[PDB]
Amino acid sequence: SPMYSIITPNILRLESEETMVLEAHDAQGDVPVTVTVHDFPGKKLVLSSEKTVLTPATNHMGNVTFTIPARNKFVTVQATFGTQVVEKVVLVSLQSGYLFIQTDKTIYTPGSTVLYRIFTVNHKLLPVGRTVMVNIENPEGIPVKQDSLSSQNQLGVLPLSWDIPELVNMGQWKIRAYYENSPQQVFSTEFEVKEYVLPSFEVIVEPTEKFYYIYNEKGLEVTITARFLYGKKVEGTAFVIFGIQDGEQRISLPESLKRIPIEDGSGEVVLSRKVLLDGVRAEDLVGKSLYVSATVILHSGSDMVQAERSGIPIVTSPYQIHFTKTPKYFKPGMPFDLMVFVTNPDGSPAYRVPVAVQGEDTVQSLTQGDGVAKLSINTHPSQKPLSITVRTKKQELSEAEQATRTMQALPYSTVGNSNNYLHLSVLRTELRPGETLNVNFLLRMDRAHEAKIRYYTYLIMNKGRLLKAGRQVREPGQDLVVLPLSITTDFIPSFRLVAYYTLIGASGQREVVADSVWVDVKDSCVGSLVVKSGQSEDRQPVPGQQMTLKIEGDHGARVVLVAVDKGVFVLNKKNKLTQSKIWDVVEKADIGCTPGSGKDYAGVFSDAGLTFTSSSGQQTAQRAELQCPQ
Amino acid sequence: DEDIIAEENIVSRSEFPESWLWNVEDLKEPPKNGISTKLMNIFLKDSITTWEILAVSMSDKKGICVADPFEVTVMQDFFIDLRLPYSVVRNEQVEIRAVLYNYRQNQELKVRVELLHNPAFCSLATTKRRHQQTVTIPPKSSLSVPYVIVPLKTGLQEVEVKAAVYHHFISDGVRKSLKVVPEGIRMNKTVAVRTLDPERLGREGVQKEDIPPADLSDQVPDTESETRILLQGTPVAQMTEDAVDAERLKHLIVTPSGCGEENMIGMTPTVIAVHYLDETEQWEKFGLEKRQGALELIKKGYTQQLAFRQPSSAFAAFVKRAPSTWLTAYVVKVFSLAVNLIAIDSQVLCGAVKWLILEKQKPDGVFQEDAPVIHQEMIGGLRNNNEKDMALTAFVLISLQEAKDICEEQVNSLPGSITKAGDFLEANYMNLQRSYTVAIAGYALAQMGRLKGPLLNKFLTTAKDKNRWEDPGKQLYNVEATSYALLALLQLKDFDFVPPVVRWLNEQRYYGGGYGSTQATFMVFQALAQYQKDAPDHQELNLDVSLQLPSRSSKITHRIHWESASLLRSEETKENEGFTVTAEGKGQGTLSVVTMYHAKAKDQLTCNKFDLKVTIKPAPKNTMILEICTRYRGDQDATMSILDISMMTGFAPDTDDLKQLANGVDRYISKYELDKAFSDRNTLIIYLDKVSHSEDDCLAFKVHQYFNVELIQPGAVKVYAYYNLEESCTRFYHPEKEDGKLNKLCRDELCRCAEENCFIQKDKVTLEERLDKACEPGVDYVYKTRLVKVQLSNDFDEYIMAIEQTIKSGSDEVQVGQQRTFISPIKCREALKLEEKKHYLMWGLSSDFWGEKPNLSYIIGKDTWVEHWPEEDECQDEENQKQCQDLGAFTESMVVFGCPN
């Protein structure tokens, strides 16, 4: 009973090479495979190409790389193995990829020119050539300029400009742009138009703690720093006031208004608990936040700058615990790994914070650089909802100040209650490209059929594509086998490893057992781009001086520069372009919607962003939604 | 002066962009280890600050990449920060600050700072006079330098100060621009809003629309105005449909089995189920996986229908039975609709069509049944023995017409048969009694376009309530007949009659499947699937808008189409034009023209939030009293406010008087500002814990003159609460000048600076020194005048001189005897000391005219010659003589000759 299988991504995309995994289990000799893609429903033949032969020498694992030209729309993926045909309807994303917009400045004066670049890249972040529509809306939301450019032969970089008229509405302006092929998916950047001049110094207000503890008698201590753009420390006088926000509404605390001398580029000012509680029961302030408003004036009165820190949370606990990184399904009786994610009240990862389950009792573990902690709990072979609660065991603190969180992990449901599981374990450390990962394959099943599991098939998911498939050899009796998986720049920022085995057992019944896992990799640039000083010496330059600017990057690439007066970012530092904001977008657009595993084998797959259809009828759930569940 | 760098040697800093190096470079430099390295030479601008350099890369291999920022800090040991405001109002006197920073470790600097003269500005610096302060700056410190100026013409004007140190070769210059704006309020007016729709009122002579300019009659002179045209498109459509939910059809997926006839009864609901579901696209709601399995059942039905194909290409219940006319006509019907679904053989489908034509058609076109089908319930309304000569010839016809495209080149007798069977139906259409016959034959004729005239009228008036074709019998024969009717309506394209017919079918709630539900189920869903195809949906936005503006020479043609993600188009013109728009085509649009401009204002003052009175009085070297009086214009007492002060150049506040204010409650002055001294406390800030809103909060301190100099720069005080910069108030103070305002004569919105010499000069003034100075190319007018009336005021004196002789007439067509007003600043009333009924010899330039002809006024400027002419009986005095003989000789040397050149 040869079983032919097929795996593709939950959502197929247009004008991209989607990969398709072809398999033949318990097969003999060669096997001719033809792959077809049809529009749904009916026949129009979008991709006839892609025919291959599965060979005993490949254990019968093949691969077809195909492209789709070019309500929701669907294709019918078709796969004929010799005479046996397997087909599955799959969902197709219209999204051509992403658009990134970059303006020169953050703010502009009526009468000036806004310089802006559009970055046209597919889902894999590589530059692509398409037609792009570009709008420019005013504050009230009215377009006043639209361009219809194309990134053909343009290496994904579309430069553009717009002269702001002297007669124009002040406030937040928006540049909106989209792919001609996908008018639903839109990309936007805001830029401010205001009557302003560049100030000659900057003001930074930093509270000693990034949060406020309602029972801290000391209060909210703030350091008002002020230095000139060119480096020198500022001498002047500062006005500072405090306020309470919840959540879009702000309440100013008038009695917190202080006037402080700014000497040697610094100043200290404190909101005493007294004033806070008077300006409104204490626990009623938990959940709300604090803001600090600074106004620094040079003792000359020739220059004045306003700054502000906002969103200082009031909390009973200096931490938060999140299970957004731990899978929600275990293997009854098998070790279960937890990814506790401890943040600081603002949302930043908390380094070196010990955590533990309920009780415990030695069983601990510290949070690393990324704010993640690695807990492992031993399980009962029961099918009962595993419930786990976590702390949070920092000394210096107190049980009352410690944080907590509680999840619920369900058991992996087995094929006809066969009690055949698979578990993938990975050693937790910040994976950098260039390193090699030791993926652990632990097999659970009665020895009666254990000798039939000779290989696992694994699949790597990344950015939403099938980065790599392969086979992990297993000899009889080997519960645990290890896979030396090399990490490259291609795994950035995160990747999924899904692996499975198949066999005939029970009463001549076809069984598929799978397990997935989500691994974070050190976020960076896929390549590298460094900008530094060309001259190998000397101090600061003088106005009108010529200097050498070294640029170190990847051969062939195109670089687009810009130089802004850091004075501007004293006015507005918002809506800048960052590599981090890029990786932020990419991630939010994963077809994989879960840290790993799944209620069943059809769950592991679909949750991770894949489609598994066999010649035995073992198929996945039909994904009707482009978005992740919630 | 001595041992310092002169003013003309100093090149000012001018390039102060906010962003630059907006470059696009390619990393093609030979790579070492996949690493390319580009070296760029750049000229850093003139800003003293820190630059942020942000690089983004794009590689077809490594994709996108944002690099970490690279900061470059540009600085200098000594420099000036000229801190302008964004904009200033024309004619409004304001103070500007210039800060000199000395960042040298332990080297104090004796500096000279000079404001340069600009005709667009009214300051202390003029053409022939510099405005230079000598000041000392201590190591590692800054020094504020105040200048007051007045912008006289709008636009991007330019201020520029320079500074140099003594005994060293250190110099700096800052040339910055600021936008000067007139006086008015932002006003937005709507010009034209018309509905662009040719056909509707916009006559068949495609709509023309005359659009007038905007009023803009109260537009303040010297301001731009932009006109924005806009093309809003009103789309709103809706040829709407409500298809039958798929969850109600789950039973229509039937496995086909049995013999020639029973196999067809089971392949029917399935083929018509897929077809309807493919067209209504409910496949998600029904279950997407179930389609593939329904394809097998349709292919399984067709495969099993090949075993009952007789050699004559015909079909019957069995293989030994005689072939059926109707069944073979149904096989054609079903297989003709399931072509895109499964692989229908052309040999099979067209073979049965060929058989029907050559074998089962009478000469007149009728089709005769010779072997009735064993299942007499699957046939529908043909079972009714009434008019089966029409019903069958109508059924077999539809089946032949739906196999047309497939069997045109394979069966050549088809065109002849189609028309033939249509000829018989057409002639006998007026003799039909059953509604069923009228419908099924009505669809058979509508397919040829042969359902017109009295026949068409009969088909339509056969409907009971105009929504159903019913006969007093079974309801499934009525569902069938309404289904053939709905098909005929769609063929003739009568979309006015359709909705009611379809609403009736939907309210029947028929979901196929049952005893003899073959026809009813195939037809009621063939009709409701073709209902979703014979859309349209809108209708169409196909507008062709042309804009002809008398300004531009080229026509502007816009095409707003539906199915285009926009429907909005705009055009902007800097000139208020009266243009015309011509639309063309289908669709209802909109045309909004919005102009923007600056309207005339009626003034506040403003300050709005603050009252301010500043007084400068002498003390009971110079030493004066500076009294400040302020008040908040709200309902509450303002919080921490600022009092920003500048001194009367060369004045320093009294230390002892300051200590006394600092210790005062609600008032603050930094230790910093205290221990400054005569050194350079030309600026001072008194912080106010509050200001009152009921009455004035007044302070006052003594100011001492440490460095006495001629022509002093008015002091300036500025208030404002800490939270808001815009809501400020600034008053000025000068010992003499009204309230710090520099002298300037204004009419309407035009102004000219008046800070200069009241007249030319005063060592012997001879006849030759008068003929030379009164014949310079510039000199226009020369009069011997008499002073009739002197009018005193608060700013400008007016000397109504009656001209007694025009020695050299100019551009002013003035006869002898008429009067001309001569204007002079108040500061010039003592130096001119002009008296009534006396005579004077005056001459000046043409730029010294004020107003419009013929009503011109004269300005006694620095090029105006004022000389006292002795009376008639005063020339007798033996001391006025020397002058009398010169003026009387200057009289006849200008009357007779005039000028040498």
Ligand SMILES: *[C@H]1O[C@H](CO)[C@@H](O[C@@H]2O[C@H](CO)[C@@H](O[C@@H]3O[C@H](CO)[C@@H](O)[C@H](O)[C@@H]3O)[C@H](O)[C@H]2NC(C)=O)[C@H](O)[C@H]1NC(C)=O
């Ligand atoms: C699917 O099967 C195809 C063969 O039909 C295979 O694609 C090949 O994938 C390998 C690596 O798995 C590629 O080799 C590598 O390519 C990179 C650049 O992409 C290069 O830098 C490395 O040095 C290495 O040679 C190979 O180019 C590619 N072949 C084709 C068609 O271009 C592969 O076995 C399967 N792909 C998967 C796992 O999705």
Ligand SMILES: *[C@@H]1O[C@H](CO)[C@@H](O)[C@H](O)[C@H]1NC(C)=O
């Ligand atoms: C006029 O200005 C107001 C704000 O003062 C703005 O909201 C409005 O859109 C302007 N009028 C138009 C339609 O241009």
